Every structure is written in C-alpha cells, then in structure tokens.
Design an enzyme around this catalytic site. Structure first.
Site, PDB file in Angstrom:
ATOM      1  N   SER A 244     -11.460   9.233  -6.500  1.00 38.67           N
ATOM      2  CA  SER A 244     -12.654   8.465  -6.760  1.00 38.67           C
ATOM      3  C   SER A 244     -13.692   8.601  -5.639  1.00 38.67           C
ATOM      4  O   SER A 244     -14.870   8.857  -5.863  1.00 38.67           O
ATOM      5  CB  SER A 244     -12.298   7.016  -7.098  1.00 38.67           C
ATOM      6  OG  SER A 244     -11.725   6.311  -6.024  1.00 38.67           O
ATOM      7  N   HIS A 274      -4.643   8.519 -10.886  1.00 38.61           N
ATOM      8  CA  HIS A 274      -5.365   7.804  -9.850  1.00 38.61           C
ATOM      9  C   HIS A 274      -5.459   6.305 -10.188  1.00 38.61           C
ATOM     10  O   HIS A 274      -5.311   5.455  -9.321  1.00 38.61           O
ATOM     11  CB  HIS A 274      -6.781   8.403  -9.710  1.00 38.61           C
ATOM     12  CG  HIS A 274      -7.573   7.856  -8.561  1.00 38.61           C
ATOM     13  ND1 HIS A 274      -7.009   7.140  -7.536  1.00 38.61           N
ATOM     14  CD2 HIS A 274      -8.894   7.944  -8.268  1.00 38.61           C
ATOM     15  CE1 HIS A 274      -7.939   6.800  -6.665  1.00 38.61           C
ATOM     16  NE2 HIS A 274      -9.101   7.240  -7.108  1.00 38.61           N
ATOM     17  N   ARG A 329      -1.684  -4.660   2.189  1.00 40.06           N
ATOM     18  CA  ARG A 329      -2.328  -5.092   0.957  1.00 40.06           C
ATOM     19  C   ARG A 329      -1.277  -5.669  -0.016  1.00 40.06           C
ATOM     20  O   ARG A 329      -1.587  -6.560  -0.804  1.00 40.06           O
ATOM     21  CB  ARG A 329      -3.096  -3.920   0.330  1.00 40.06           C
ATOM     22  CG  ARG A 329      -4.229  -3.327   1.206  1.00 40.06           C
ATOM     23  CD  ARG A 329      -4.934  -2.122   0.560  1.00 40.06           C
ATOM     24  NE  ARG A 329      -3.979  -1.055   0.320  1.00 40.06           N
ATOM     25  CZ  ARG A 329      -4.138  -0.009  -0.471  1.00 40.06           C
ATOM     26  NH1 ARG A 329      -5.283   0.211  -1.106  1.00 40.06           N
ATOM     27  NH2 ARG A 329      -3.130   0.839  -0.601  1.00 40.06           N
ATOM     28  N   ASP A 375      -0.147  -1.780  -5.421  1.00 40.74           N
ATOM     29  CA  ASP A 375       0.005  -1.750  -6.895  1.00 40.74           C
ATOM     30  C   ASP A 375       1.299  -2.392  -7.437  1.00 40.74           C
ATOM     31  O   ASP A 375       1.439  -2.624  -8.670  1.00 40.74           O
ATOM     32  CB  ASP A 375      -0.112  -0.317  -7.422  1.00 40.74           C
ATOM     33  CG  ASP A 375      -1.488   0.309  -7.121  1.00 40.74           C
ATOM     34  OD1 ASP A 375      -1.520   1.315  -6.367  1.00 40.74           O
ATOM     35  OD2 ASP A 375      -2.523  -0.247  -7.573  1.00 40.74           O
TER      36      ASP A 375
HETATM   37 CL   LIG Z   1      -7.031   4.802  -3.544  1.00 43.46          CL
END
Ligand SMILES: [Cl-]
Ligand SMILES: [Cl-]
EC number: 2.3.3.1
Lengths: 437, 437
Positions: A244, A274, A329, A375
């Site tokens: 990105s 991605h 994160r 994630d």
């Molecule tokens: Cl990323």
C-alpha cells in the site's frame, strides 16, 4: 508565523532537512549498502534496500517506531480526547509530519482543520449512492477517491506551472483535504451497504476526527469511539516496503496528486496478500470456537493446535521473520480488551491462544519468532461493538494508513524525490548477463 | 487441444518455462548482478536491476523489442486487416503472450473472442453517464475500471480457494475480458465529454478491436482506423520499469485482480511525468508554428532552435540516455504520414525539425543521443484526423498499454512471482548504517 499552524512549522523544518541530506549524499552517495542477486529479482525484491521512507522504521527488538518513538511511548505522550485515554490520530499525524509531539492546543487545531475541510462534491455523493451492493467496499472507496481528484489543487497548480521547490505546499493542502474527507466517504459506503442507505448526517466542528467518523457510521457507544481512536493510530504506518505504501510512493513520484496516489494504494491494499489478515484470523477463530466449544480446557486447546500444526496448517496471526517479540500493536489491543470487554467469549479464546500457542510453535521448532501481530487481535474487538461486516474491515485499515502514506508523500515532494524507475530484465537477458559476467 | 486457442497454447508453454527458470535459479540465483548505493535509494532506484519483466526489452542499438522482435520485424510479420497494411494489435498481444507470431486464423479468432466478451454492466454505464465534464478523462477511466472488478472471476475463485498453480487460468480470463471492455469504456468517456453523450452503438462481431473502437468513438475515415491499429500496437509495452507497468506489477503481486491492477496503473500513467509527453510536444509545436509561420526557411527554424537552447530551454521529444538512434516507433509514424498526410502543415514542421534539430543538439554538445522518440510524432497524427482533445490522448496510451502489462500479468502469475516488498530505510537509518559499515 505560527505555534499551532502545522504548515508554518513544516516550512521551517524542510530546508534544514534538505541541507542535511545534501551533505550526507555528498560524502556517502557512492557507499554500497547491498548486492542484488538473481533470486532477489525473481523474489519480488526480497531483502533489497530500495527506497527511502522517513516516517516509520521497524526495530527488531521493540516493534514499529514512529519518528523514533515506540508504541508504548506514543500511547504515553500523545494527547487524548477529553475524558478519554486513547491517543488521537490527529496527534499521530502531527508527529509523523513534524517529528515532534504536539501540544493539546495543536491537536485541537488540527481537529478543527479537518472538520472545516470535510465536504464531498455532489457527483461523488451521487456515485456512491448509485453503486450496487455487490461492488466490494474497497472498490467503492478507491473509485470515489479517484473521482475526488477533480478537487485537487496540486493538479490544477502544476498545469499552471509552479516551481519544483513549492510542490510540497499544495501537496500538503490536498493531503489535509483528503484526510478530512475520508471518513465521510467511508461512512457513506458503510451505510449504503449495511444500513439501507440512510444519511451519514453532519460533521460537528467541535469533535475530533474519530468521533465524527463513528457518528457518521451510526454508532453511539463511547467505548467504540475510543476503540476507533486507538485503531486508527496504530495501523497508521509500517515502513515503505509494504504494497500500500510503496504503491502510493511510486504513483506519487510521477507527480500524480494525493487522490490518485491514495486510490492506487487502496487497490494494492485490497489484494488478498496485504489487506485480509484481520479477516482470515477472525474466520479461523470462529471455526475454532465451534470445534472446541466455549469453555475449553488448556489441554484440549493445546491438542487442537498441535493437531493443526501436525497437519501442515498454520495458526493465523502468529510468527514473524524479524520482530523478536509480541507486536506492541497486539499488546495495545490486549490491554484495551482487559479493561473494556474481559468477559467476552471470543476475547477469552484470543487470550487463551496467547497463553498456549507460542510454546507449541517452539516444540515444532519451525516458526522462528512465535509471537502474534496486530491482526490476531483486531477482529474480535470490532465484532464486540457490533462491527461485524468483515468485507468492510479493510476500509478501516485504509482510513488509518492514509495518515502514514500521506505524511510521507508531503516529504517525498519537499525533498524533491525523483520518479521511481528501476530497471527490468527478462529471463533471457539475465541468462545472457550471467554468461558475460 | 487447439491450434487457434490461445489458452491451450499457453498451457503447453508454461511448465517448460517454469522448469527453465528453476534450473537457472538453481545454479545462478546467488549471482550478483549489481550494487545498491545510497544515491540509488534517494534516486528512485535509478540504475538498479530490480524486477523480471518478460515481454519487452530495450536494445540500445535497435530500440524496444517485443519478445525478441524489433519493430520493423513486427510490422513485416504481424497480420493486417483485409485491405489494410498496419499490424493488428490482436497479433501483438498474441506475440507478447506466446513468444510466437500468430497466423491470420489465430488473429481472426482473437478478434471474435474480444467482440464476444465486450459487455458493460449497467452500474458502470450509469456511473460514466453521471460523471461531470470537469472530471478528467483518465480519472473517469480508472474509476470505471475499478468498478468493473465486480466482474472479476479470479477474485471470486480465490475467495473459494484455488491452487496457486492454477491462478494464471482465471487471470487470463479476466485480462481477456478487460481488454475486450476497454474500448467500450474509453469511447463512452469520449462521447460523454466531447459528443454530447450520444450512444457508442453496438459491437460488430466480424470486425477487429481497433475498428470497433473507432466506430464507437464516432469516426468514419478508414485511414483513422489504420492509424489506430498502428498506434495501439506500438505503444503496447516498453519494459517493466516505467511507472504504469511497474504499478500493475506491484499491485498484481498482492493478487489484486487485473481490474484493480490496471486501474492502479492508470493512476500512475495519469501523472505528469509519465503520461503527458505527446501533449507537451503538440503544445510546443503549436506555439512554434505561430512564432515562425507556415513556410519557414531552414535557416530561420535553425535560429529559433538555437535561441531556445541558448535560453536554457529544451526541444520536447528529442534526446535519449540509452537508445543510440531514432526510436523506431517515431519512424513508423513518419512513414505513415509520408503516405497519408505528407502535405499537412504541422507534419511538415515535424519533418523539418527532424531534418534540423539533431545537428543543433550536437553543436550544443550536451544531449547525448539527439534523436526523437514516439511522442514527438503522435499528436500531429491524431490532430489531423480530428482527434483534437488533448486531455483524452492519455486514454489512448492506456488502452494500448493494457496489452503489454496484462500479457506480463498472466506470466507473473503462471510463474508464481511473489509479493513485491523491497526494504525501506529512513535518512537516520542510512546514516547509522554507513557508520557501522
Ligand atoms: Cl502493513
Ligand atoms: Cl512507457
């Protein structure tokens, strides 16, 4: 000029940064940093130091750093909403653009600026409202951002001729305008797909960016707005080599305006390699809870995982090639969940995996660094507040990643980075080349 | 399977190509082809051998080659329309995909295939018709291509799970469908902007791609259709390092479908440093003819040019860093003009510059290789047949460049090329690195 004006602060930083790169390049521009091999060319430039991206750098020991600052340090130092404890994305952007931690009064200024610039032209509203429900939300987002380039002032000024050294000024304006507009576009998509095309309502000029966004989405829980603040801050940037960011960088370098650069970047984010990790994990968690049940024993969970590794499958969201510990994160989201939704059944599973998986990955030996990434935690949090539309989750990632890729884009242009134009070779030419080599 | 089926021919080639790359990489994957320097990283990867792109390679002595064949050789060998003498773009695509020169019967098959697949969904027609006349034609094109990804069969199949080794099959289908549709989209844009939103009419299944396109554009001159054939063939590909091609390659590598990859690539083409050379030349020619007049002497033209170089300005469309002679894509257009419009005043100027400029560039010494490129000739040709809308000229370049970038995209996926993901560094990290180095 101004304490609280971002653009005056930027104008003062840029020439000092130009001079420091020029003298660095004067003594070391010829310094060899790596070799290119045949395998790197077939291998998607794997392990090739290929571009300069200023806003974020991965520390193998501490995780992603934003202009030098680790995530824990950012949570500490960045301004929060009043009554809140999660960092505002406005302050993250300020830090990425300036290298400096903004005051409460600078962040408050930036909130107002974004509210003042948030407007969509009628052709974009009309376009969004006419899209069918089978057009994926990321396609809707990219096409609407492409269609806003009619509002680019860099595009206009370049056609009228402006000096190279002044590009960054209008780039800055267009980026500020695009960020302002993003939540409006994204919320129209959400409501048209999932709330029967009801109105997103009006912007409130005394609220922050995230709060206006959650209002326009139709959410009312104060803690969802806190989640959104945190989420948008932590997904904001992760170096320049991801698809990105590199896509924005590459399209940008042709002096395509921020609208066009960002839409192109969303087409790369939409790629399954991605943009889909959050969803893949949540689907796997869902399947898992069905298989093993709601209060599974540590033993029986461990068995399931072993059965899964010994079947040539993997645990999604776990394992890194470089980072030697848990993604911070991931840790940020963990703590949020421990304060606000510790009794949720899917969180308990996510917590239970965190207890158990890493050791099972070691017994297998294989996976180098058996720790979870951002994630592995984000879906269960969205889900809890009722944001269950998994196709939409990449749109949120995009609204966040704008902050990072556009902060860099301003600096790519301030520093006069040229067109990106590596040299390609065919298989035949490589063969010819290694025989003359 | 089939003589004339492109997909059967492709299926037979792919495993032999996989095996040849695997054994090459087995003995030479570690072979060093270059060094990366600090300046290359700041310099947009200038002079860095970074990717494998199979369809086209620049020969410094002969110009761009398509799968080994020079342009002169292509004009000779590729099938023409009946009664025509310009090469059909269908045959160019065949050559790029297969490495082989198609028969008349294979090209005729491919024309029919493209006619059969040319259909637009109602939401795209509706979107195009609702765009305002101030939205640039390249933004219109990209957004409409993004919105067609609802029709991607690769996107659908990937979600249902398919094997890596079979990606190329559905990629091939989507590329074939996108090429088929491109002229429909592009002609709707042309008519809505420049012919009061009149209908593009129907596809005729017995005509070739270019002829259907010029019909849908509203043109009737048989020689404009011949121009279009030539034009679409010669702009089709030019290695992988240019921004449009590299953008398709990069977005593609994330397994974004051809629609999304191609739209992203059009956002890069729309950049002023990639997509505007034809127009810049035509504007300069226009200014020139006004200054010096319609039957200017060789002497007075030479003076103007010298006055222009000695003023720190440049002659657009002239000079290359690598190619040691006139671009053969320039020569192709020259000959066309000599047969079909030799008395046109703007062509005479373009011819007169070709006589005079190169020597004046040498007297200045400066410019290394003082010869013209494809962009020095294309505008005057479009203009002559009444295609005067310069903002639109990048759309034609795009419709052409699809052939090249999509032929490669099929092979990127056939050969299992991975995600493109170079490593970025900040100025601070480079500094730290050369001090530990
Ligand atoms: Cl990323
Ligand atoms: Cl090109």
């Amino acid at each position: 000029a101004s304490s609280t004006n971002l653009k005056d602060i930027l104008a003062d930083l840029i020439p000092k940064e130009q001079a420091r790169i020029k003298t660095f390049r004067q003594q070391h521009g010829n310094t060899v940093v790596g070799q290119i091999t045949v395998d790197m060319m077939y291998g998607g430039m794997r392990g090739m130091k290929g571009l300069v991206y200023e806003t974020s750098v991965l520390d193998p020991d501490e995780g992603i750093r934003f202009r030098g600052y680790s995530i824990p340090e950012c949570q500490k130092m960045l301004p929060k909403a009043k009554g809140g404890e999660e960092p505002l994305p406005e302050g993250l952007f300020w830090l990425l653009v300036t290298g400096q931690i903004p005051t409460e009064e600078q962040v408050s200024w930036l909130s107002k600026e974004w509210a003042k610039r948030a407007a969509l032209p009628s052709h974009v509203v009309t376009m969004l409202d006419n899209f069918p429900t089978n057009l994926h939300p990321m396609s809707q987002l990219s096409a609407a951002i492409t269609a806003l380039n009619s509002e680019s002032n860099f595009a206009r000024a370049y056609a009228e001729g402006i000096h190279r050294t002044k590009y960054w000024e209008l780039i800055y304006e267009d980026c500020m305008d695009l960020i302002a507009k993003l939540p409006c576009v994204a919320a129209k998509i959400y409501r048209n797909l999932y709330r029967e095309g009801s109105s997103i309502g009006a912007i409130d000029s005394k609220l922050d960016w995230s709060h206006n966004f959650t209002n326009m989405l139709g959410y009312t829980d104060a803690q969802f707005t806190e989640l959104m603040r945190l989420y948008l801050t932590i997904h904001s940037d992760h170096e320049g080599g991801n698809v990105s960011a590199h896509t924005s960088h590459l399209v940008g370098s042709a002096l395509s305006d921020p609208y066009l650069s960002f839409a192109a970047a969303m087409n790369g984010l939409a790629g399954p390699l991605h943009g889909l990790a959050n969803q893949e994990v949540l689907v796997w968690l869902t399947q898992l809870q069905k298989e093993v049940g709601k209060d599974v024993s540590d033993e029986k969970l461990r068995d399931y995982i072993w059965n899964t590794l010994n079947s040539g499958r993997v645990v999604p969201g776990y394992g890194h090639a470089v980072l030697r510990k848990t993604d911070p994160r991931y840790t940020c989201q963990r703590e949020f969940a421990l304060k606000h939704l510790p009794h949720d059944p899917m969180f308990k599973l996510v917590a239970q995996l965190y207890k158990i998986v890493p050791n099972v990955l070691l017994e297998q030996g294989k996976a180098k660094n058996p720790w979870p990434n951002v994630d592995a935690h984000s879906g269960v949090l969205l889900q809890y507040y009722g944001m269950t539309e998994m196709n939409y989750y990449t749109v949120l990632f995009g609204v966040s990643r704008a902050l990072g890729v556009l902060a860099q884009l301003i600096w790519s242009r301030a520093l006069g980075f040229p067109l990106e134009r590596p040299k390609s070779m065919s298989t035949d030419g490589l063969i010819k080349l290694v025989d003359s080599k």
